[PDB]
Amino acid sequence: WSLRWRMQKSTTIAAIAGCSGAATFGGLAGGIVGCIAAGILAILQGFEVNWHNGGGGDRSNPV
Amino acid sequence: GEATTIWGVGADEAIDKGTPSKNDLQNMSADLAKNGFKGHQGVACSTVKDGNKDVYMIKFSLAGGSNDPGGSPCSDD
């Protein structure tokens, strides 16, 4: 399993709230990057139902 | 901070009854966050793949708007 991605819009805006349980997996050590990774993880897990059964939708996670 | 939520706008390409292990999901998420967003706001276009199979398309949006960005999914097949 892999995630092929490309940035459609890249910015230097760092205004991102902090979070609880910032990820420390995959070489990450928490922090805002960890907040983003934990956010993506939740969204990907949420979407498993949609590749299993079809359908789309908008999923969100605090970051 | 301004951005408080990350959104994923998705659609299915193919049905796949398989499920990636946590190890795979962790690697996928870490890669995008670290190398794609790099701790900044932005928009990513992605495809979840199961080997060579294109399974799911997701537009990931991290912006100042906590509101659902709507729009269409985008991909990187």
Side-chain angles (χ1 to χ4, degrees):
Chain A
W1 293 87
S2 69
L3 187 67
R4 183 163 160 104
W5 51 264
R6 60 186 166 85
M7 301 298 300
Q8 175 195 88
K9 187 211 80 189
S10 290
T11 82
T12 46
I13 301 170
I16 301 175
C19 70
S20 298
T24 63
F25 54 67
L28 265 39
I32 295 305
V33 172
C35 289
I36 300 164
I40 295 170
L41 168 79
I43 290 179
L44 292 167
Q45 294 171 310
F47 281 130
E48 287 179 358
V49 80
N50 297 107
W51 68 68
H52 290 161
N53 299 301
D58 297 9
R59 294 184 181 268
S60 83
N61 198 79
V63 93
Chain B
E2 193 208 15
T4 66
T5 315
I6 190 182
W7 282 95
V9 176
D12 184 49
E13 296 193 11
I15 292 293
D16 186 323
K17 301 279 180 188
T19 306
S21 64
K22 172 168 52 268
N23 280 351
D24 275 1
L25 286 174
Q26 284 182 162
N27 178 64
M28 298 166 41
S29 307
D31 183 47
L32 213 205
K34 199 207 302 90
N35 300 317
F37 287 98
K38 295 177 190 181
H40 308 125
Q41 291 183 7
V43 173
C45 293
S46 73
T47 295
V48 175
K49 298 169 42 75
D50 171 10
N52 300 100
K53 191 179 315 171
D54 287 320
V55 177
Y56 209 83
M57 56 164 84
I58 306 165
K59 164 180 78 173
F60 283 99
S61 166
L62 204 206
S66 60
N67 276 3
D68 184 359
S72 308
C74 52
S75 69
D76 193 13
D77 290 347

